[PDB]
């Protein structure tokens, strides 16, 4: 066999690109593409919480107060500065998952208890502190005033709201973030006017108008609409072709199915006699005629328009001894363009054209074409042929591409306005006509009759043709323009194949229904292609995010090919065991090279001028170790009694730790604990409290070293933390006898943050009872005048032959 | 002795492709019509009635 | 045993990698050598090291 090494092989190259499994499957995900399901909460960014705490004064004593300080909520910090970073991004990230785009304030206040004005405030978690702070016996007479005369200020005239808040600093700058760069726009109907594309509301076969009220409380979300800074189209072309491929099944999905055409049987009877295939000696004497069917015309129909607008470039599977299939094909390479085909099948076509039509028509001598030469079969015969007509028809289409212009911000490739009115193809049959009246001669003459008459076969299908041309014209550009994603042209790995039969069905059955798209398909294609371009730019900012706060936060461990599948993962189009290795790596620098989103920047930016405030708090870690082997002598606080605490980090040879859990090179460290040198151990590691005065004396502190050297991993690393105070069993001892309560070990560690009332006392504002629609072309009634009466571009009906 | 550092290198290679053993598969083909078929002097064979 | 926990080509390579980090009795430097010793790429070539 050979068919089945072949389908080894094409599966040996499909096994490299990541289109999914049959391909049909695609248009039920395309479609599944939702929108950024818009998000907003009952709830306050809260990263702290206030408690009431015990305090011990000076002489060690407890005193007869707690006092209010803010400690985090849910504390799960881990060991290891590493890990902590790992613990900020994976608390930035799922910001991120829960980042709202809008906020209402009235969806989440709720009464003060202790409030002699009806106030209200903004949440529970404030009025269960406003409460406490009330019937405290500590708090001030001005704060309690206050409380009972803090009266909000809503004013609906202005649409604003200002409600008072009770947070720490940190908590207030996530949430006046949040408040003051919301993602929403004010709204109203000109807008969708101007939303929709410019060549439809000017094209008069689609009757628009609006039917619906819009409030000024109306909003939406602007999607981002941002073009191609990937650039998918150099050194991409696996994923282009997956993104080709996608394309053109949803534009299978949205031409329409043509109706009242020609009968398939009475253009079989007579394509019988006109070509009288009952007095050949060939081997084809039944297989001329296959392949004219319907749902072939269609699916052609279908396949050209999804092939152009999608650049998905396509390939040609043709029998050359059926003639009729290349006089069916000069007309699409008329009026299709020539980039669009792979060159070495077009080249084909066109040399089988030359050497069984054209040439052995006009007398020449065949040909002798180098396949390997830019320069094209047609090219040469434009030069070679002296006839004016076959000539200009050829140096059209030679000349015949698409071009390159920029609508709307974004690009388009179109045509020549010479096809999208059908005017060249009477050139073309001029052409035919002069080939009808022609002889051939050196040929068999009634295979040159045969010939001669499946030439005029399309000579009567002339206006036919034109309206044919005109119509598949029209459909593409008003498909065209319900596209965001700039159409970039291509050569692609894999290629459809198109049968030329499904181009001889299309060019002779066919008349007279013209079949455009309804308002409702088009805004389906369009809804899909700006959902899709929506969430391709919104997934490449989380990547870059990630990726470049990983690279801002040192986490140098973290392979980045894993974000990177989860991004091309959630497009639902890309199958990733599938995928190659190098391309990925293309992408990681380009993903790299770029700007980042704004709103994702900022979360960043706060969560950095604070992590160095947040994980100081979180009491079951320290942020290093002293060791100086001099009787040194604990220093009093007030939330501790006595501590080995330290709060400079200052004469002494700093070491960190994570240089030194990985590189294993523990002679810089036991050549200072042996010979007794002092040294800072820096690293987010944990500790205990150790409350026994007898411990002190004996030094256990110094204990929890000596395992470093025997076990070289500093993961089991455990310092001791002496708070002592008045409940500690054994403080007699400190407070008696006259002496000074000493060690060595000092734990550097910041005290936490007091509560203050008016550093943290805010009035947040926000707006009132806006409706955030989403699906905003449901507000655009529109219809279809009836398909008889069309125009298109110039005026002019559109299938003209009536 | 086995000095770690000295007996270290780096291995280049590609990264990523493909290779293809029968080379013929990608090109389909066929004939002209046998009446139309020529020979170096670009004139018919077994055109003599 | 590697800082960017990156890669190397065989598994016996990697062996004697986790077999030296592990022993008492071999020194710092090439632990600091094994952390440095990962995998370069260069996609715009098509090429690794």
Same mark, same amino acid.
């Given at each position: /066999?050979? +068919?089945?090494? &072949?389908?080894? #092989?094409?599966?040996?190259?499909? !096994?490299?690109?990541?289109? %999914? $499994? @049959? ?5 039920? /995900?395309? +479609?599944?593409? &939702?929108?950024? #399901?818009?998000?907003?909460?009952? !709830?306050?960014?809260?990263? %702290? $919480? @206030? ?10 004593? &407890? ?7 803010? !400690? ?5 910090? @881990? ?724």
């Amino acid at each position: /066999k050979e +068919e089945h090494q &072949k389908e080894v #092989q094409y599966e040996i190259l499909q !096994k490299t690109i990541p289109t %999914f $499994e @049959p391909k049909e499957s695609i248009l039920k /995900k395309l +479609e599944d593409i &939702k929108p950024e #399901q818009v998000k907003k909460q009952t !709830k306050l960014f809260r990263i %702290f $919480e @206030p408690r009431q705490l015990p305090v011990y004064r000076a002489n060690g004593e &407890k005193e007869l107060r707690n006092r209010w300080y803010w !400690k985090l909520k849910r504390d799960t910090l @881990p060991d290891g500065d590493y890990d902590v970073r790992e613990y900020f991004l994976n608390l930035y990230d799922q910001v991120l998952t829960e980042m709202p785009d809008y906020l209402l304030l009235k969806d989440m206040a709720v009464e003060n208890k202790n409030s002699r004005d009806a106030g209200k405030v903004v949440d529970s978690e404030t009025a269960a502190i406003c409460d406490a702070i009330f019937q405290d016996e500590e708090t001030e007479g001005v704060v309690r005033r206050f409380i009972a005369e803090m009266r909000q200020r809503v004013q609906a005239d202005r649409n604003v709201v200002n409600y008072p808040s009770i947070l720490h600093p940190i908590d207030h700058a996530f949430n006046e973030y949040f408040l003051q760069h919301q993602l929403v726009e004010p709204l109203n109907n000109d807008i969708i006017f101007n939303y929709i594309p410019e060549r439809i509301r000017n094209d008069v076969n689609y009757i628009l108008n609006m039917d619906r009220n819009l409030p000024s409380t109306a909003r939406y979300i602007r999607p981002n609409l941002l073009q191609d800074r990937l650039n998918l189209h150099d050194n991409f072309e696996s994923l282009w072709d997956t993104i080709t491929t996608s394309n053109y099944i949803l534009a299978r999905s949205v031409v329409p199915d043509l109706k009242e055409l020609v009968s398939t049987e009475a253009q079989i009877q007579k394509m019988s006699q006109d070509l009288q295939l009952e007095a050949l000696t060939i081997q084809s004497e039944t297989q001329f005629l296959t392949g004219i069917n319907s749902q072939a015309a269609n699916d052609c129909f279908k396949t050209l328009i999804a092939a152009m607008l999608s650049q998905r470039t396509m390939s040609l599977d043709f029998v050359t001894t059926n003639y009729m299939s290349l006089i069916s094909g000069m007309w699409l390479l008329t009026v299709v363009p020539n980039d669009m085909f792979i060159r070495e099948s077009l080249v084909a076509c066109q040399l089988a054209i030359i050497n069984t039509i054209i040439y052995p028509a006009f007398g020449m001598q065949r040909m002798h074409y180098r396949n390997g030469d830019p320069q094209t079969p047609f090219q040469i015969a434009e030069q070679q042929i002296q006839n004016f007509q076959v000539a200009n028809w050829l140096h059209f289409v030679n000349n015949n591409q698409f071009r390159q212009v920029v609508i709307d911000g974004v690009l388009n490739q179109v045509l020549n306005d010479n096809i999208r009115n059908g005017h060249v193809v009477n050139q073309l049959m001029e052409a035919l006509m002069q080939l009808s009246r022609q002889q051939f001669p050196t040929m068999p003459v009634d295979y040159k009759r045969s010939i001669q008459r499946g030439i005029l076969l399309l000579s009567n299908r002339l206006g036919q043709l034109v309206d044919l041309t005109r119509l598949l014209a029209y459909n593409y550009e008003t498909l065209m323009a319900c596209i965001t994603m700039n159409m970039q042209h291509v050569q692609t790995l894999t290629t459809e194949k198109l049968q030329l039969t499904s181009v001889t069905s299309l060019c002779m059955l066919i008349g007279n229904a013209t079949v455009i798209p309804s308002p409702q398909t088009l805004f389906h294609y369009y809804n899909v292609n700006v959902n899709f371009h929506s969430n391709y730019n919104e997934r490449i900012n989380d990547a870059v995010a990630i990726i470049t706060a990983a690279n801002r936060l040192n986490l140098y461990q973290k392979k980045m090919k894993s974000i990177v599948e989860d991004f091309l993962k959630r497009l639902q189009i890309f199958d990733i065991s599938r995928v190659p290795d190098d391309q990925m790596y293309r992408l990681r620098d380009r993903l790299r090279l770029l700007p980042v989103e704004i709103r994702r920047l900022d979360i960043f930016n706060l969560i950095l001028m604070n992590m160095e405030q947040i994980e100081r708090a979180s009491d079951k870690i320290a942020q290093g170790v002293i060791i100086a082997y001099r009787d040194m002598q604990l220093e009093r606080d007030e939330m501790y009694g006595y501590v080995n605490i330290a709060r400079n980090l200052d004469g002494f040879q700093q070491i960190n730790l994570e240089e030194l859990m990985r590189t294993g090179d523990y002679a810089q460290i036991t050549n200072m604990l042996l010979n007794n040198q002092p040294v800072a151990l820096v690293g987010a590691l944990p500790f205990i409290t150790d409350s026994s005065v007898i411990s002190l004396v004996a030094k256990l502190d110094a204990t929890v070293f000596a395992q470093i050297v025997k076990l070289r991993k500093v993961d089991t690393l455990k310092p001791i933390l002496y708070k002592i105070n008045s409940d500690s069993n054994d403080f007699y001892l400190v407070a008696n006898y006259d002496w000074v309560p000493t060690s060595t070990t000092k734990v550097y560690k910041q005290i936490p943050q007091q509560f203050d009332f008016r550093a943290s006392m805010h009035m947040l504002t926000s707006n009132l009872t806006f409706t955030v629609y989403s699906d905003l072309l449901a507000f655009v009634s529109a219809d279809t005048v009836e398909p008889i009466n069309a125009v298109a571009f110039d005026n002019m009906r559109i299938m003209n032959e009536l």
